[PDB]
Amino acid sequence: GQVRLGMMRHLYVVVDGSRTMEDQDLKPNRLTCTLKLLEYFVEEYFDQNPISQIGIIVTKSKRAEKLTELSGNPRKHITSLKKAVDMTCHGEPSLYNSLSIAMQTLKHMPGHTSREVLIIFSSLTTCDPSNIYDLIKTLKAAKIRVSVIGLSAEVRVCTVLARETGGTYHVILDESHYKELLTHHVSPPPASSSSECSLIRMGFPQHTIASLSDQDAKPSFSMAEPGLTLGGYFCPQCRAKYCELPVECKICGLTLVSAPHLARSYHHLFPLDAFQEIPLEEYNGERFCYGCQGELKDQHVYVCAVCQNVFCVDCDVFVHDSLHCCPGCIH
Amino acid sequence: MKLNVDGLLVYFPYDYIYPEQFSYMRELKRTLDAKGHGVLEMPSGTGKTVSLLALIMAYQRAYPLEVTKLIYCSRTVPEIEKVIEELRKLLNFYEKQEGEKLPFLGLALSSRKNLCIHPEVTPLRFGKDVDGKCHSLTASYVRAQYQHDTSLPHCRFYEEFDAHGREVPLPAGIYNLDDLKALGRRQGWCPYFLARYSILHANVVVYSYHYLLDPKIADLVSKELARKAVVVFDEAHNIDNVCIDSMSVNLTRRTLDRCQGNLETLQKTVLRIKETDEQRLRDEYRRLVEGLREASAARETDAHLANPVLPDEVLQEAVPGSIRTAEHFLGFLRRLLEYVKWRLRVQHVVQESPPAFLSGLAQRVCIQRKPLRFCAERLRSLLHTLEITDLADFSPLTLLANFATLVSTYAKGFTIIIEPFDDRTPTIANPILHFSCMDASLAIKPVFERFQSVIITSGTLSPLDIYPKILDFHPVTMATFTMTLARVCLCPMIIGRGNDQVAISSKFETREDIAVIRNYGNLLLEMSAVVPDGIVAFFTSYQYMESTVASWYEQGILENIQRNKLLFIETQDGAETSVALEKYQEACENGRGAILLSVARGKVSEGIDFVHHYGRAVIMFGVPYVYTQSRILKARLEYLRDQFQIRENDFLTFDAMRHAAQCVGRAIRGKTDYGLMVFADKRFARGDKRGKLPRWIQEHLTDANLNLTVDEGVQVAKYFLRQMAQPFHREDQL
Amino acid sequence: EKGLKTMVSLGVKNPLLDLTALEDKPLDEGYGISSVPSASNSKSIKENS
């Protein structure tokens, strides 16, 4: 797509902790497989979108539990998921209070964040404290986007939830299909005609080591069991002390970003194109791969759009998944 | 899609069909090549009504020179409205394609429950009381008394329709019941009598069965209309049951006591009107002697009650005997009432043929045959004469008089069976009298005589060959329709094997066997744990559903079924069933699992059509077997052995399978739907019973699925739903 | 439930829950071909429960 995307993205993951998480349709029980692919999900999402954040709610025993708050580093989330392997999964799940707390925070937030909730939802019987239909009308009117990945069944309710919060509903066959769905929700989803297009004020703090062998330095502890920090990253708005640069300013409200962070997600904006895939021999006067200078010992030849060079299957998967650019069009 | 159907272009309505639609053309290619009835079977996948109308319009467009009027006949009132609006969609498509000039008077028609306006008749809830108050507010004589006075009661609707409304035909507008009521509100009319007056000008009329097959209602489509008419029945499994409901008559001791009170009331009315007037009684004696009771019959719109229940070809044209003086006719009804009351006194079950009952009459209370034929004409003329107002009060005696007509008309095909007691009637005298019929053919007989080409469509392809034999019927076409699919869309399994390897059956004849009910509950539990979007569970009889859900409670099963889904058990109240259905459809919308368990005979599975997501797994409990059969069944089976040639064990299996596959055969409402339809007992695997399910369900009944266990069936359900919940887009069907 | 059906009434009953649809059900007060629907007799113990 050549469309607007939601690139600052407070996503918020709601997992079941239902009775139906303990069912053994997957190769381990659904809790374990779901939690493993969420570990992979947090990894690839922080690997691809650096500005954004994640928060994890386990929904358990008709109540909702904010298990890990909305933050932007994978250590705390994956540590909490390694903890949450050990849980119990008892009682029916309430999708009311958790969506209420997520709405309550995601109603007054800066209008440019595409505020997104991902409900990995398994069971069928849901207890509703208010009216479910009025909750969807409210959540339709409340600026947020909710997408539900479903297990074992499809409720016209998850379809209404997905198409109204503006999300997408999906049901799971396999391990591989479920990986494809979470990979589909890694990428920044396109924006509606409703979300604010603001201009967030940003800060770009340089790294600062101990000035000149600590000749008149500023010895601090940290800012969020810490040692004595000699130098590091400042915050020019408030001039505080941060160890890791990609941290929302804890005492100002500025967002702090290093030079790579914006460049780590530039491929979404000038994206790739399609490779013309042709299996047969077909006029190939360029026998060797323009990717890595190797012969084409298979019947799959892939030719770009602009330069129209030659690529094999290995160069296809590598260019379209990782390098994100054609090597020909750079030249 | 622009079909050539051998004479005409046909614009497929929306533009989506399976290759079976091309096969569909071939099936009716035989049907209209030669005119002569014809029985079709398109399953519930294709537009049932849409399919039954595209090709008939293609033939009438290619060569529309021998068809005046379509009379569609669907039973339930929502279907009447649904078929009219699909016809209206097809005309809107037809006029999008062409231009503006599309003359076409579509028209529904039901009754005074559903086309009456008047705010004092409208709050009545029952049909006979609405008919009684409509007989009060308009008549042949109350209308005249209002015509030469001012303050006498009138509707203002029928009077204004009488003023101007019988000269303007309804211009080309397809009308529902609601649209027709609105037009009755608008200019100020009766849309009931507007609809009946505008039968003559229509092109498609959509009313119910009992408005065509009853001889005592259907006196409104004449011979000259019928010689070029195409009648299309729809959902026509129980045509024979409609006929036997349409000519049998039940008499009860309460009916005869209220008949005695009616007789005393009418005696007092004859006395006081003898004190009042004499001249119209002279005119009565004239029009009995001179004519054949047709003097004031020309202006007869709301003076018509239910007519004579003899058929259209067995009525007479003579003079009614010794009956003429109304005092002597009250003596005549007095004699007949006391003899039928004495005959009902017998405290054992007595079967007779109607000539034996006529001979018992003509010997022991001196009533002969021809004055017993003319009793219906006499009571209708008398009850028109004495100006009496609320005819609901006179419902029993008319019944008795109409019963007299049948006893004096038909023989060798019908049967008078007397029961001193029934089933559910402990410590209560309830002697009833079935004049029951068992010729199915004697009610559709004038439907094949008058009409050009009648066709019946069933979404379930019930074993058909038998129907022609029953109905005295010889068709042109016996065309079978096959479900052509790009996706399996359904799987039937025959779970006839318990998890303990107990043979699941209902051989015990409703006297409970414990382990079989245990395996039924285990099936329902594990199928609850697999299936989403609800589960429909049809049992055999309400005594058997009663007993089963009883012993699912003392045995510890039903709380687990509660843990998986929400039950909605059925009852034989008219309002409690509707509330249980409404909560069953609200629970699916809530998303919490629901499960409706009902009986495979009642109204729960007649009107209802499988929802895309309202029933995913139609659980047919048992084989439609009853345990309260007196002797109407034995006598209809003795008849089908004797004068038709259809066996005992053939007709029982046919009837059971048409009910079972009726309640489980409308699942594919839209080709793109997935529907689990389980049959739960071992008898559906036994070759003759499986052999009489339709072809579009036997095609997908695999030998591995034949006699599954509970848990094997649950795993087949899981694999079914998982393979059939994926994106099956339009591009997988072209 | 019996107060909602007998004493108390509903609320959402206009085009939805139409009175005419309710009128169609329950047949007629006078004797009918299959009147035997609600029996004033035959009240047992287990069946009532």
Ligand code: SF4
């Ligand atoms: S005459 Fe018309 S308005 Fe009056 S009761 Fe009959 S149908 Fe209703």
Ligand SMILES: [Zn+2]
């Ligand atoms: Zn700051």
Ligand SMILES: [Zn+2]
């Ligand atoms: Zn290129």
Ligand SMILES: [Zn+2]
């Ligand atoms: Zn290569």
